[PDB]
Amino acid sequence: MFMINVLTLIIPILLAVAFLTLVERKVLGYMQFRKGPNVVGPYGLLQPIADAIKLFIKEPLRPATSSISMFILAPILALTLALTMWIPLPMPYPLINMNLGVLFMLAMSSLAVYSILWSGWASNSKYALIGALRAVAQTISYEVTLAIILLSVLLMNGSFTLSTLIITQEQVWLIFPAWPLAMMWFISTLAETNRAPFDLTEGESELVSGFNVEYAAGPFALFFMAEYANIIMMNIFTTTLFLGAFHNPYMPELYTINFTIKSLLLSITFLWIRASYPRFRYDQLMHLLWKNFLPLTLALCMWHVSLPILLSSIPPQT
Amino acid sequence: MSLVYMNIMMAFTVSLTGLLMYRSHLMSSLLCLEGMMLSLFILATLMILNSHFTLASMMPIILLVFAACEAALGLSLLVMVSNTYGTDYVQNLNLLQC
Amino acid sequence: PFFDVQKKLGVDLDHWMTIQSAEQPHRIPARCHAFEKEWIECAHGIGSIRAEKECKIEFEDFRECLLRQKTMKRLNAIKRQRDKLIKEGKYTPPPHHSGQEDLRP
Amino acid sequence: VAAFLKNVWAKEPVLVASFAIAGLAVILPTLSPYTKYSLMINRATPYNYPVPLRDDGNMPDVPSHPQDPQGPSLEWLKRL
Amino acid sequence: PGIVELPSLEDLKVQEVKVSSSVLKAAAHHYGAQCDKPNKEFMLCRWEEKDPRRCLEEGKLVNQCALEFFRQIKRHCAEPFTEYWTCIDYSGLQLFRRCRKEQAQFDKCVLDKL
Amino acid sequence: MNLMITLLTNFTLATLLVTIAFWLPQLNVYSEKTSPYECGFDPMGSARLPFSMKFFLVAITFLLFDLEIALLLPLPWASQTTNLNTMLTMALLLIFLLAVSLAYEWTQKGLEWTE
Amino acid sequence: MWFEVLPGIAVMGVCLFIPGMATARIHRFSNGGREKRVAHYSYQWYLMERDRRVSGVNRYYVSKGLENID
Amino acid sequence: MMTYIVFILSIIFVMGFVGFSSKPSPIYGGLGLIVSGGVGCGIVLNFGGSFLGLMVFLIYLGGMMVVFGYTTAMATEQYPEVWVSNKVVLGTFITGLLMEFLMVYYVLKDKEVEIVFKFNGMGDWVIYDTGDSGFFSEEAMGIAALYSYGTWLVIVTGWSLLIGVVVIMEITRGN
Amino acid sequence: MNPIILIIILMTVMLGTIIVMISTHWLLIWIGFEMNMLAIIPIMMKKHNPRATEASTKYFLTQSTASMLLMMAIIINLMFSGQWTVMKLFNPMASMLMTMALAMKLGMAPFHFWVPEVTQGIPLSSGLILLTWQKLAPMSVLYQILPSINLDLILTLSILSITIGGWGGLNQTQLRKIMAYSSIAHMGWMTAVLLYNPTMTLLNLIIYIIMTSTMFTLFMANSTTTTLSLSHTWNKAPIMTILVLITLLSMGGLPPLSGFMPKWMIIQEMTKNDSIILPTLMAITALLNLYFYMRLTYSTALTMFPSTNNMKMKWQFPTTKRMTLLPTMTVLSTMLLPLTPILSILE
């Protein structure tokens, strides 16, 4: 019975990833004064099916100079970590109701970097090494500020449980008292997933393709669905953190519709940002978070740890 | 005692005999140091959580902090070495034999 | 040398984490609070040389509470004897030890 | 010091905002009168069981029943 | 060492309060108010004796008083308490704030009748 | 019980999508297709050469900072203690020491990249 | 025009509507028409185990009311 | 055999320790240490310390990632050894695994072993406590008492970290 | 190095040693040891030459291994005792591991290999700071756990350290290696008498610190690193030759100098416990330390080695160095015998 629950969790997110490829292509085309795919089917509904069937009947092309074991393990680890880290999200009831879901998602987001790193190192190429080291630089740029942002915004919730975050935002949204943390969190989620303007790993300008330049079709699709499932999970995580919707225990479909449309708007905002900005340099991103975001994050952390004591508004931990 | 205590102590001894016989590479010795630190952390928190000594739960995490207080330091003792010589072999560190 | 600064100035620095019978948060007791309390109260102020042979019963009981070696030995002997009797077919498990037991509440 | 403040606000406003937020967070809890409210709110939360005392015969401050008027009440917390 | 002393299975036999956890939670406050003295005596004995084998009779009295309390509820206010504990039992976290109207009905009925 | 079931399910679903991608199509492997890609020309040297890094100092700073902010993570639960002035003072002192260390790194040109 | 991005997005909406509510439906199926009870702290787990023992069917969601007592 | 879950996780722990302590190459040593940290956090999470396991997992993942960046940068070779490219590394890995599985077989036969201490053979589930802990987890309150009680520990740790930052600045200077 | 940063680092070293000395918790002992090692590493990196990098790397590896063994023994003692009081231990394996860790931290043989190389690769200031101050905390920890050390292990370590230091001091021309081997021999001398009466150990520690500081400060004043410049010192200032002669005669255990203060009374504590072979062997082995001290005095003061022409210019410039407490330290290291019962203040 739990098998039914986990398969009904993991199949619609793959379908969502494919239709996210469709929506990304069509919306990005329409923002560039042109049209997206509409010839494959009725309004292009069959383009992701054609892409998926095409990519799984092509040659795998395992290189000779690459360590084959890590070359196979890295996309498997990427897709796996993209799968078993959707679980603690309350929709409105999570599949796994972890007591420490926030730290779990932090740890498994730290673990997903190793797939990119071992993909870059395993395939014996210089561009893959450059992409892997740029991923390392991006991780050391963003991780500490991301964790302090989460700690400062969880001081009003009471605990690390993601299920109690709806109860915290039952009266008002959490973006009203923590909007600078919300903006910094949005930039951190943009830089976490290597999305534009902080791509810097699959750079088609400075490099050819980066870490996945030696990965032909079949294994290359795994990184694509891992990245797109990652951006959907960041959108849902940001929606739960800062845009908590009204929850009725008798009608969970209201909360499901509400956070579904909010996460869709957040993904639309992601693609809106993608089409409009030039790519950051990966040394400028390093000085962005470590010099501008970090002092403000420390000041806001001290403000948010001295605020509930000041106002007799310390939230319960139960 | 128990069984997991025996396994963690065996892991500590395995990492100790990994550390004490160098293989011409400093990073491997640093990895062995991190492994022994991890084994000590795991044994300490296993004993503490078994014995319900709640006030000593400040001990392991604080302990983990001081791990970096040598481990990152070891990296800072490598870059000058890697600026003195092109590699990080331990056989190049034999100038102090006279 | 042990320059005892702490008792000289009356400043508590690390005396609260020294034992498990101290002021714990929310009065959470250790699993062997009574044994350690008895061992400390037995061996208070009499010196280590006298305490090694005069309060050995309380310290031995506390060490048995800490690691449960004799309890493991007794349980292992009982389990081994039970498995041997099962293997010889001389023993049948009781219904309350097999699952259909109907506990109290 | 107005010239220095204007120059540092024109050059690096992020550090000025961070230092102002830090200064408010440092000097503000010592000025607000609501910290003791947090103190007795945290002390009034019943994590553990209120273990009763033996009635020796002379204890006028503790009640015999929880509904007796003697004892620490929290009408202030209900009011706030 | 000495043989551990354990009471026989006849001494532990008592008619238990065989209700669910939500049934106990729904009528927790009135049970605490009405049956306070034998529970307090039992827990004082438990904290002063440090031995479950020396506090058996007080536990028996606690069970008897709780069963009498639930029997007194069952005689007069069966259906509003039924609605209240059902509404408490529906919620996953057993929240007290989700069932205020059935609660107000239950204490109104038990204040007017009892 | 459920967490390892979910882990095994996701691992099986991931690892089945490569053996399907391997054994299904028609493969044609020669000793020119699987060469390392360097924009049409064969590379000079190997990809295992020392890749001289620049941000080593900030890497060590991140090594310290990850756990030095991981000390700050029990601050929600630390708001539930009875002693609150001492907790507030110690937390403010910890983040103040963090800020002092960051400012010392900034002023001594430690965040800049070498060469 | 632009509204043709609305069909595919709508499919995405269905692709984000199916899983979570399904879990709720699963949580309304196994637990006998109620929410799946949460156990964040050991007291809640002890109450869960007491309910499972007191139901007599080895199912914790089988709620026995005040008709059980005399 | 599900009652020996912590024992199996500890077996994988010592397996990973043997895997990276043979020192083949720091990439695969880092992979082995990541696996060992994962199963160790699983062990301590099985004992109830979920926060401590998640924290040590996150900290060691970050440390191993910085380490991997360093070895890609500085400690590299033309032909790195995976595990079998060197005879001595493969040999010592094989004897480490053999000694571990020999100890497993010996402790799984008479349920007792003497390596310098004395160890049982039953699963660790016996040594658990039978009572509940109320509305709090003991490890969370214990680590939360760092600020209310451990003022001296916080002071010396913050000073040690600040001095460490200054030391890192002073060492890698060159003049 | 900035003077502010140098003052802060030296204060951190002092704070770490104080934290080890005054704490009643094992975790605080390990924290103080870690802080001491972290703040003592960059002192040796003061001049930024490769030999400092080798010395720092070797010292860091040895101290990290010692700290790991110390924490393992602390955890085992926690397992077998369930407390944290810094007192006697309740497991012989924990006592053995703590003794091995403190022997590695003290540089006692057969863990003596890093001592002469680290001492030679670092300047005289860092060498003096190491060989005098860093040998205070482990001796205090050994003082605290007195009813726990195995007698055979600590006595074997002491006699091994004395013999190895006495043998190794003969074949050196560098002054820093000579001081390192002398420190190893004195380490064995202090740990030989620890289990009988640690007041004699404290007396020997104070005397050894005074004499080592005097010799190192004289090496600062003469600006000498090798034996040849120390020989050449007779042309610049003969008073320095007189001072190093009487100091090296003091460190050889020759009465009526203060270097006869510890060793003699150490013998006075081994014959009361019916051990007559060991003090005799220890004195016979300390004759080797006296031998290379006599060789140093022959090279430096008692013979007039040839000099160069450029020293004439050094006759026109007097010394302007901050010789801090040098006459008081020389007087303490030479003429302290008739105040022998002063050591009763160390009880």
Ligand SMILES: CCCCCCCCCCCCCCCCCC(=O)OC[C@H](COP(=O)([O-])OCC[N+](C)(C)C)OC(=O)CCCCCCCCCCCCCCCCC
């Ligand atoms: C989740 C909700 C929605 C969030 C927003 C999402 C939609 C909008 C997205 C916009 C496009 C983003 C694309 C990527 C941009 C990347 C660059 C970037 O972000 O750079 C950050 C830049 C960095 O600046 P920089 O890169 O120009 O660097 C300047 C460097 N110097 C000065 C040396 C030349 O700005 C920040 O870091 C600001 C962070 C947010 C600040 C919030 C301040 C709130 C108010 C505080 C108080 C102020 C009053 C004074 C005190 C009063 C006290 C009482």
Ligand SMILES: CCCCCCCCCCCCCCCCCC(=O)OC[C@H](COP(=O)([O-])OCC[N+](C)(C)C)OC(=O)CCCCCCCCCCCCCCCCC
């Ligand atoms: C100049 C060159 C020649 C020098 C010759 C010097 C003398 C030769 C003999 C010296 C022996 C050592 C001192 C012994 C003092 C004994 C005092 C005493 O109470 O004895 C009774 C005690 C009796 O033991 P006890 O008193 O502890 O026990 C109580 C008494 N009974 C035994 C009854 C229970 O004797 C001893 O303890 C042992 C004495 C013999 C020691 C053997 C080891 C030393 C061997 C000689 C080394 C000499 C130096 C060699 C190198 C020279 C430099 C190159």
Ligand SMILES: CCCCCCCCCCCCCCCCCC(=O)OC[C@H](COP(=O)(O)OCCN)OC(=O)CCCCCCCCCCCCCCCCC
């Ligand atoms: C007591 C208050 C709380 C203090 C502790 C808590 C602090 C929280 C925030 C932490 C900030 C961490 C980082 C701080 C770095 C400061 C040093 C620095 O880097 O200065 C450089 C900067 C000039 O820039 P530049 O030299 O070009 O930098 C190189 C690349 N940009 O130099 C500058 O821009 C000048 C920086 C110093 C002057 C700032 C003045 C701010 C005034 C705000 C309003 C009044 C606040 C009153 C409180 C006291 C302030 C001292």
Ligand SMILES: CCCCCCCCCCCCCCCCCC(=O)OC[C@H](COP(=O)(O)OCCN)OC(=O)CCCCCCCCCCCCCCCCC
């Ligand atoms: C969460 C929601 C996810 C939704 C995913 C799917 C979204 C799109 C849904 C379908 C939309 C319409 C697609 C229409 C495709 C084209 C159909 C067509 O016209 O095919 C014609 C082709 C050739 O036929 P011919 O013989 O030439 O005809 C003679 C005409 N005089 O004949 C053929 O090609 C053969 C027949 C093909 C029929 C294909 C029908 C669509 C299949 C889509 C796959 C997914 C289906 C749904 C799965 C989930 C629900 C169960």
Ligand SMILES: CCCCCCCCCCCCCCCCCC(=O)OC[C@H](COP(=O)(O)OCCN)OC(=O)CCCCCCCCCCCCCCCCC
């Ligand atoms: C060779 C390369 C690697 C190949 C294999 C890759 C496998 C997948 C790797 C990715 C996943 C790694 C997972 C690591 C452990 C994560 C632990 C976790 O998620 O814990 C969440 C949760 C904690 O919540 P808690 O507060 O304990 O709640 C109890 C009260 N209801 O926990 C719970 O609620 C408890 C649920 C049961 C937990 C059982 C004990 C832990 C099981 C660990 C399995 C093995 C992990 C191996 C990781 C290897 C990483 C390289």
Ligand SMILES: CCCCCCCCCCCCCCCCCC(=O)OC[C@H](COP(=O)(O)OCCN)OC(=O)CCCCCCCCCCCCCCCCC
């Ligand atoms: C039972 C337990 C007993 C514990 C007793 C503790 C007593 C107090 C602590 C004593 C330990 C040693 C303290 C000093 C350590 C060394 C300091 C040092 O090396 O300072 C460096 C400084 C450099 O001076 P300068 O020549 O200008 O610089 C050259 C360029 N680098 O200066 C020098 O190089 C010159 C030397 C300066 C210090 C000399 C005086 C102090 C050390 C000797 C002790 C003197 C007697 C007092 C204590 C008696 C008991 C030990």
